[PDB]
Amino acid sequence: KKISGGSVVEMQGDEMTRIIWELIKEKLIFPYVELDLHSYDLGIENRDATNDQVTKDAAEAIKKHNVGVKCATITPDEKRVEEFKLKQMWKSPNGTIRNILGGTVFREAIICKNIPRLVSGWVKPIIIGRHAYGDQYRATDFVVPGPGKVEITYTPSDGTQKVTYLVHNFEEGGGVAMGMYNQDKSIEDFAHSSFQMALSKGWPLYLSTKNTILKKYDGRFKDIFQEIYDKQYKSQFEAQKIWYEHRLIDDMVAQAMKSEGGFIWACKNYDGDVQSDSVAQGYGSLGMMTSVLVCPDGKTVEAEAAHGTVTRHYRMYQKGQETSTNPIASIFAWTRGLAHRAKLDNNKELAFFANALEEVSIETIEAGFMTKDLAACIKGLPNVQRSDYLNTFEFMDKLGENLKIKLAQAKLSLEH
Amino acid sequence: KKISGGSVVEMQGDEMTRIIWELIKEKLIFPYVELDLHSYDLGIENRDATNDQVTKDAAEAIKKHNVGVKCATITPDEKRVEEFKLKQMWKSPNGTIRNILGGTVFREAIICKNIPRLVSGWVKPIIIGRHAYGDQYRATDFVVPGPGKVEITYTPSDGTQKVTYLVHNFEEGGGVAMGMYNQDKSIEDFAHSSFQMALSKGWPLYLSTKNTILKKYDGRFKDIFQEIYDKQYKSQFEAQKIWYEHRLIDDMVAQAMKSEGGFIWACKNYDGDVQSDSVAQGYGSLGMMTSVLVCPDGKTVEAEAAHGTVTRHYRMYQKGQETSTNPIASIFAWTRGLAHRAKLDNNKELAFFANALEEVSIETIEAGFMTKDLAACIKGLPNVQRSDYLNTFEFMDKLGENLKIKLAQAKLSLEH
Numbered sequence: 001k002k003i004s005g006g007s008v009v010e011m012q013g014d015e016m017t018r019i020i021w022e023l024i025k026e027k028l029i030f031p032y033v034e035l036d037l038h039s040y041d042l043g044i045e046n047r048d049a050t051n052d053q054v055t056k057d058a059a060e061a062i063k064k065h066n067v068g069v070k071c072a073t074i075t076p077d078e079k080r081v082e083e084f085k086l087k088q089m090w091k092s093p094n095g096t097i098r099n100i101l102g103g104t105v106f107r108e109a110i111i112c113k114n115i116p117r118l119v120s121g122w123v124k125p126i127i128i129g130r131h132a133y134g135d136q137y138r139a140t141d142f143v144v145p146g147p148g149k150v151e152i153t154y155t156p157s158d159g160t161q162k163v164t165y166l167v168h169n170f171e172e173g174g175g176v177a178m179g180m181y182n183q184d185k186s187i188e189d190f191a192h193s194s195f196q197m198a199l200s201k202g203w204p205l206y207l208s209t210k211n212t213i214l215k216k217y218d219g220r221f222k223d224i225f226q227e228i229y230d231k232q233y234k235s236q237f238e239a240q241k242i243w244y245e246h247r248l249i250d251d252m253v254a255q256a257m258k259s260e261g262g263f264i265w266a267c268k269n270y271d272g273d274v275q276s277d278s279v280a281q282g283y284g285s286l287g288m289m290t291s292v293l294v295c296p297d298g299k300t301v302e303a304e305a306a307h308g309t310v311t312r313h314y315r316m317y318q319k320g321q322e323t324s325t326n327p328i329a330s331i332f333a334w335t336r337g338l339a340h341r342a343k344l345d346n347n348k349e350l351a352f353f354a355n356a357l358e359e360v361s362i363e364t365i366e367a368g369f370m371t372k373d374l375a376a377c378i379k380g381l382p383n384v385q386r387s388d389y390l391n392t393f394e395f396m397d398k399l400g401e402n403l404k405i406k407l408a409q410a411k412l413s414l415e416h
Numbered sequence: 417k418k419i420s421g422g423s424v425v426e427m428q429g430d431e432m433t434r435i436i437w438e439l440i441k442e443k444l445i446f447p448y449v450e451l452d453l454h455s456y457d458l459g460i461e462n463r464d465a466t467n468d469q470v471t472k473d474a475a476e477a478i479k480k481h482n483v484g485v486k487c488a489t490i491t492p493d494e495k496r497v498e499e500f501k502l503k504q505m506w507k508s509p510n511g512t513i514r515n516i517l518g519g520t521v522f523r524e525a526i527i528c529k530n531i532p533r534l535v536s537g538w539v540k541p542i543i544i545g546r547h548a549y550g551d552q553y554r555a556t557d558f559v560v561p562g563p564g565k566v567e568i569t570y571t572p573s574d575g576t577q578k579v580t581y582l583v584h585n586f587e588e589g590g591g592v593a594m595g596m597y598n599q600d601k602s603i604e605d606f607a608h609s610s611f612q613m614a615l616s617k618g619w620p621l622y623l624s625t626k627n628t629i630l631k632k633y634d635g636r637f638k639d640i641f642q643e644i645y646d647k648q649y650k651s652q653f654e655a656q657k658i659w660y661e662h663r664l665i666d667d668m669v670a671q672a673m674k675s676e677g678g679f680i681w682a683c684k685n686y687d688g689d690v691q692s693d694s695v696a697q698g699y700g701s702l703g704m705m706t707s708v709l710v711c712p713d714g715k716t717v718e719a720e721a722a723h724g725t726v727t728r729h730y731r732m733y734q735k736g737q738e739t740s741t742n743p744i745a746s747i748f749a750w751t752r753g754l755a756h757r758a759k760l761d762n763n764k765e766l767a768f769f770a771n772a773l774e775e776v777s778i779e780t781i782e783a784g785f786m787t788k789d790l791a792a793c794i795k796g797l798p799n800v801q802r803s804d805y806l807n808t809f810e811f812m813d814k815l816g817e818n819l820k821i822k823l824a825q826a827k828l829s830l831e832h
């Protein structure tokens with residue numbers, strides 16, 4: 001008898017992460033968990049074949065079933081259009097899913113005691129709450145071909161007025177222009193999720209903006225967060241001896257860098273993207289990070305592996321050359337997704353399994369069993385020998401081996 | 417007789433940096449150099465009093481005399497408007513100056529051997545080339561009060577055809593919107609300045625963008641850089657065994673983080689702002705960074721103290737209680753400004769003095785004489801005692817004492 005997992009929406013990806021995703025399912029999930037799996041192929045060839053409709057359908061399924069688990073995908077550029085003979089240069093599927101679901105993407109490093117940090121002081125975790133909606137990821141940008149005016153206009157639905165703002169009058173030559181936006185309700189949900197995360201972790205909360213430059217745009221994020229804080233969370237924060245504070249982005253990055261960690265950092269969409277990669281790398285490895293989208297309904301989540309598709313590895317794998325790919329972030333997309341599914345259904349066994357697989361992952365690396373990238377973190381790539389690491393299959397087999405052990409011990413620990 | 421220094425534009429600033437600025441002139445510059453000083457008070461009260469006209473006047477004076485030295489200023493928001501009873505929420509003076517002058521702001525850490533880096537690997541320097549024009553710093557942002565359409569339009573003055581794009585149809589409630597732009601000429605100047613800096617330093621060059629998301633806007637920065645490289649700089653980069661590559665910003669912050677340094681990082685306006693503070697902090701301190709605006713003409717510069725106005729120390733100072741503020745970045749604005757003035761006028765004496773004041777500044781800190789904040793970098797703020805540092809005046813007096821010694825030994829060393 002396997003654990004009755006319930007409904008999970010899965011999104012298949014590309015290149016090396018696609019190969020690894022299938023191994024995770026077959027070796028670590030399917031032998032122990034029985035799921036009502038709703039599969040959507042978000043591979044570059046299937047998104048092309050469906051005119052990117054598959055991405056939209058996957059997002060609607062996540063709304064219906066409340067839990068999604070996503071593999072890393074290619075956001076194509078000119079070179080990818082050539083390689084796959086694409087009909088169009090399809091938009092980022094993470095951007096599409098996030099703009100349908102909305103909410104906040106919570107990112108945290110996956111800490112293994114034997115992996116060295118690149119930032120000395122970071123002894124406690126930094127959780128980034130990245131606003132998942134609008135700004136640059138739902139922007140309208142274009143090339144300005146020559147002289148002419150760029151204007152941005154607002155027309156209320158009542159049709160009683162029109163406001164025209166001059167962006168720029170190009171007098172000689174062209175350039176680029178763009179329009180972007182955000183919604184009050186989305187910012188409000190982003191504020192609530194940031195305050196709630198801070199209270200659940202018992203850590204202070206910092207919101208970063210550039211409101212001295214974007215006085216109206218970033219000023220609105222500052223205003224909404226302060227008003228929600230003062231009216232609904234300030235007394236709860238004081239009771240927990242924590243606090244909420246606004247910081248200018250350039251001040252905040254330096255503050256985060258010299259801190260000892262132990263804080264929630266609410267980031268606007270773009271800063272969340274860039275700063276979560278700097279933080280992940282600061283803790284030791286880019287691919288050692290969780291990434292969970294928490295939707296405004298307080299019920300729907302989408303967990304993902306936020307790193308790349310590992311093309312260099314994929315090319316080696318295609319030529320039959322040996323590869324050593326870190327599967328941890330992809331495993332944690334599954335565990336964070338299964339833990340949330342367990343929390344919705346009150347499934348103690350699924351919750352136990354989700355946590356056990358995270359523990360096994362960390363314990364295996366901590367015992368000295370790891371992929372070539374993690375071995376290069378400790379020893380340095382020139383000093384790495386074949387005996388120091390396990391290839392992709394050896395590591396997956398090793399995790400499966402210890403997962404079988406951990407789960408056997410957990411069953412054997414049960415009182416008669 | 418003092419050194420004949422020539423014409424320099426000085427922009428006085430705000431709070432703690434304003435106090436330190438007058439100390440630098442009185443103790444380190446004026447006793448040794450005689451200047452045709454064109455002084456502009458960019459203090460918040462004088463900007464309010466002149467309706468920000470003094471800022472525009474200072475930028476025009478920089479164009480005329482080719483060298484500006486700027487003190488850190490307050491960019492007001494709602495709190496600053498309430499504090500100083502401001503007529504308006506004045507725009508950033510740096511933004512005003514940069515958008516009149518144009519160019520690239522080159523930022524690099526000020527290195528002292530006794531100061532520990534927060535990033536262990538950075539054994540070689542990272543030079544950030546911040547595009548000084550447009551984007552967020554010349555954008556049009558506004559609050560969207562309720563439902564309606566926000567549209568962006570281009571109207572050629574003499575072109576193929578006009579176009580209107582929907583940015584967003586706000587269906588329920590309001591939010592925020594913004595339009596921003598950049599110019600081809602400004603991007604081309606940014607490209608040439610970046611390639612020339614890499615060739616002069618002998619290091620590879622990286623340009624960061626988010627061209628996977630802003631396909632047209634950021635794609636143009638990527639296209640302009642590549643075209644200028646392929647036609648005008650590739651062979652020269654190959655001869656020096658260096659290279660130019662484009663990186664996605666989120667890939668770039670993680671690559672920079674795990675690197676050993678030793679490269680030029682061409683950043684877009686916003687990234688240059690954010691990442692320069694991350695890089696300064698990583699090397700040890702925010703107060704240990706140079707910032708020189710290099711204009712496209714190859715003749716005009718504006719050197720500044722890129723950091724804040726240090727409000728807390730200014731509050732302590734107002735209360736009458738002892739302060740210890742790092743003045744090195746403010747001193748280096750003067751020395752970089754004066755070194756460019758000397759290069760323009762073929763002034764051996766001014767060139768010698770500028771370099772001597774930099775040497776003195778580094779040697780003083782390397783001899784264990786420093787400010788409270790710098791003492792906190794080696795020991796950690798809770799372990800720092802009144803014996804570990806000098807007060808603002810004490811450190812300035814020590815620098816002045818050591819400058820007098822270096823210059824006297826330099827005069828005695830002269831061959832008959």
Ligand SMILES: *[C@H]1[C@@H](C#N)C(=O)[C@@H](C)[C@@H]2CCc3cnc(Nc4ccccc4)nc3[C@@]12c1ccccc1
Pocket residue numbers: 702703723724726728729732738739740741742743788789790792797
């Ligand atoms: C300065 C210090 C004194 N005197 C002090 O007691 C605290 C209150 C104060 C905190 C704020 C602050 C800000 N900036 C600086 N120095 C600085 C920064 C960037 C550029 C130039 C100069 N110093 C302080 C100060 C402090 C902060 C941390 C550790 C020690 C001192």
Ligand SMILES: C[C@@H]1C(=O)[C@H](C#N)C[C@]2(c3ccccc3)c3nc(Nc4ccccc4)ncc3CC[C@@H]12
Pocket residue numbers: 286287307308310312313322323324325326327372373376381
């Ligand atoms: C050529 C090198 C190679 O031979 C290696 C193999 N097998 C893997 C290699 C690498 C190995 C050791 C140090 C540095 C790099 C690599 N590893 C990863 N890991 C990863 C996995 C999951 C998420 C994110 C990242 N990502 C990229 C590359 C590129 C270079 C590879």
Ligand SMILES: [Ca+2]
Pocket residue numbers: 273274277306666
């Ligand atoms: Ca990213």
Ligand SMILES: [Ca+2]
Pocket residue numbers: 250689690693722
């Ligand atoms: Ca800054």
